[PDB]
PDB file of N, CA and C in Angstrom:
ATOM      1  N   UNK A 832       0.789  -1.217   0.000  1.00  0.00           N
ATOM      2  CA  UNK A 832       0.000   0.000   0.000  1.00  0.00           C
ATOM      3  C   UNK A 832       0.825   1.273   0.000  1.00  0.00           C
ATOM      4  N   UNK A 833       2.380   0.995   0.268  1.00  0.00           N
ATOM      5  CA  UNK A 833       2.913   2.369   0.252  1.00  0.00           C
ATOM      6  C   UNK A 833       3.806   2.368  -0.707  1.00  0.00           C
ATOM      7  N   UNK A 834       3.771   4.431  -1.796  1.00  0.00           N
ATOM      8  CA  UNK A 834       4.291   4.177  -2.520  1.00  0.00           C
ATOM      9  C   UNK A 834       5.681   4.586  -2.755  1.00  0.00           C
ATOM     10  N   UNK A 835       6.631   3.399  -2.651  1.00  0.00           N
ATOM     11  CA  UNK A 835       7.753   3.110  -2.316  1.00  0.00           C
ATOM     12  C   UNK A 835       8.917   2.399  -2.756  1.00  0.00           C
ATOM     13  N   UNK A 836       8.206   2.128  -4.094  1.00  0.00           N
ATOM     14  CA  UNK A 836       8.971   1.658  -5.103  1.00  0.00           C
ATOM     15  C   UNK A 836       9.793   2.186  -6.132  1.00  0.00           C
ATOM     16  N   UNK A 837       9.312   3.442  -6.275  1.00  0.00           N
ATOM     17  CA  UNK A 837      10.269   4.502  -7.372  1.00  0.00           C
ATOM     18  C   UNK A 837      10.039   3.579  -8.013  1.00  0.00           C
ATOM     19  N   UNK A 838       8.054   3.537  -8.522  1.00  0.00           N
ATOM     20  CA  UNK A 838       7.877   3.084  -9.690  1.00  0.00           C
ATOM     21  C   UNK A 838       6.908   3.143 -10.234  1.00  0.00           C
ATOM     22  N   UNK A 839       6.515   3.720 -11.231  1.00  0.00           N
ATOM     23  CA  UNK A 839       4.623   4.036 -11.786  1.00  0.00           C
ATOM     24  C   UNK A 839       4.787   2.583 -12.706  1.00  0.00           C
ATOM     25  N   UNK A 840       3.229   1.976 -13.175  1.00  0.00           N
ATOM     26  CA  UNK A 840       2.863   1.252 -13.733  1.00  0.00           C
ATOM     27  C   UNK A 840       1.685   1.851 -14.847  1.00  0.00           C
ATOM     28  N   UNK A 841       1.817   2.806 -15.637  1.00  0.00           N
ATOM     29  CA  UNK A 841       0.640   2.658 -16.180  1.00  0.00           C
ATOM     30  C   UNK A 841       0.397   1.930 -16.870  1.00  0.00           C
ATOM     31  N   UNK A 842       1.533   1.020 -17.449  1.00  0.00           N
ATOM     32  CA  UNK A 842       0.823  -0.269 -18.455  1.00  0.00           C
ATOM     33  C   UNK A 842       0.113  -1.405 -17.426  1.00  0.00           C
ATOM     34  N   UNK A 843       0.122  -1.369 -16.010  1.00  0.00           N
ATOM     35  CA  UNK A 843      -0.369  -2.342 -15.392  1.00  0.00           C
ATOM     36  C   UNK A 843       0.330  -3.158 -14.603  1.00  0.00           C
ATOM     37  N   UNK A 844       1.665  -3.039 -15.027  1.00  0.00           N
ATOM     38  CA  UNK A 844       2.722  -4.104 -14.334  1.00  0.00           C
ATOM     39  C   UNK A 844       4.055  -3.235 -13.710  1.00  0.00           C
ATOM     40  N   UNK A 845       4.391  -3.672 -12.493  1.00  0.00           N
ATOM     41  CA  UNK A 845       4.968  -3.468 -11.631  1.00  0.00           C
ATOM     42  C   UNK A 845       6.766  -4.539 -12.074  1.00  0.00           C
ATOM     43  N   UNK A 846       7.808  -3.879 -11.891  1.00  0.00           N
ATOM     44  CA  UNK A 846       8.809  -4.854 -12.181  1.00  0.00           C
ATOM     45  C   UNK A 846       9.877  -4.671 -10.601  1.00  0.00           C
ATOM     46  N   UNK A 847       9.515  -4.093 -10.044  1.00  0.00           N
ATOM     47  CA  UNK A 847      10.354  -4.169  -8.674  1.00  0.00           C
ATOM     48  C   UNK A 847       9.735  -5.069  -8.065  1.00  0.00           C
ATOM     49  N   UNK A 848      10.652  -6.109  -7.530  1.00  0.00           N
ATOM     50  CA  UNK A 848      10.190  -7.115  -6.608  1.00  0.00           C
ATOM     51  C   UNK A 848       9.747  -6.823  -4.956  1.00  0.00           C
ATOM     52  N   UNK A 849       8.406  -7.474  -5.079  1.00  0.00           N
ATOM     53  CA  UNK A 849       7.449  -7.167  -4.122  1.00  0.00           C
ATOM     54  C   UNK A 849       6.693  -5.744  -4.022  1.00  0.00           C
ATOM     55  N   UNK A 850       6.790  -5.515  -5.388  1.00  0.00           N
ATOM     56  CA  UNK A 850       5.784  -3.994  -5.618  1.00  0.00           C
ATOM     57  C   UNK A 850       4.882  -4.864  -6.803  1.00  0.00           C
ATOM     58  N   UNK A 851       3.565  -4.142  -6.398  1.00  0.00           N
ATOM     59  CA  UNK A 851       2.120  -4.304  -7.183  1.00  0.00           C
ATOM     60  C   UNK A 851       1.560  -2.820  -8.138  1.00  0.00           C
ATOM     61  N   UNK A 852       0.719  -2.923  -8.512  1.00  0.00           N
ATOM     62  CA  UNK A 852       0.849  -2.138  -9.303  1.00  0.00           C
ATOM     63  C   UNK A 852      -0.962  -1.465  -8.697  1.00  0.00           C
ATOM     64  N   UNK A 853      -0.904  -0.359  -7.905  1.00  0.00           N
ATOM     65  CA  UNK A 853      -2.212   0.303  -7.447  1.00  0.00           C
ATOM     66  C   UNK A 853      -2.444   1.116  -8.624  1.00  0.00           C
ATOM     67  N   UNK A 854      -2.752   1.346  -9.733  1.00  0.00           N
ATOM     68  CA  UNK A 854      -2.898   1.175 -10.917  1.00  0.00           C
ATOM     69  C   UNK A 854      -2.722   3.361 -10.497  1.00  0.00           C
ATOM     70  N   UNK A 855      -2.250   4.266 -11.207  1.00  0.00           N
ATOM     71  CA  UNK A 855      -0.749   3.701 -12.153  1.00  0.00           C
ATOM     72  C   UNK A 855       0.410   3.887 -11.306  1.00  0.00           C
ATOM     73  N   UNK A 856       0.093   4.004 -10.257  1.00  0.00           N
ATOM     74  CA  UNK A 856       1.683   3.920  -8.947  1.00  0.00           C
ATOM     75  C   UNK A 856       1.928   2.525  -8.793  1.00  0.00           C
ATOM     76  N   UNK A 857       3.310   1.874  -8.451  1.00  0.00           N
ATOM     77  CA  UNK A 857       3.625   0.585  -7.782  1.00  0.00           C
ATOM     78  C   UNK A 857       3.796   0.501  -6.258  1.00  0.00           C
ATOM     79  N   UNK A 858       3.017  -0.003  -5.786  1.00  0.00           N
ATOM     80  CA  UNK A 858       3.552   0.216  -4.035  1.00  0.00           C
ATOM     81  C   UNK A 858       3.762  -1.148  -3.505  1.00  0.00           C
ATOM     82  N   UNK A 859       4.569  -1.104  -2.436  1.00  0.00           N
ATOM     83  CA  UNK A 859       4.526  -2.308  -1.536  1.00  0.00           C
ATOM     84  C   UNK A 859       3.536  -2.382  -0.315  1.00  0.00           C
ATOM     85  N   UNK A 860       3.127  -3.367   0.178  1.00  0.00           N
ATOM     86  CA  UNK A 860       2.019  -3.390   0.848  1.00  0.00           C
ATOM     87  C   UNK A 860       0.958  -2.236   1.166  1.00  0.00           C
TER      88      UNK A 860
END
């Protein structure tokens, strides 16, 4: 849930491990 990945997703997918993609930020839990 926090965004903490130094990573946007707007295609949907997240590539840092253990980041998701809260559509278009990547966060971890």
């Amino acid at each position: 849930g926090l965004p903490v990945c130094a990573e946007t997703c707007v295609g949907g997918t997240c590539n840092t491990p253990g980041c998701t993609c809260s559509w278009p930020v990547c966060t971890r839990n």
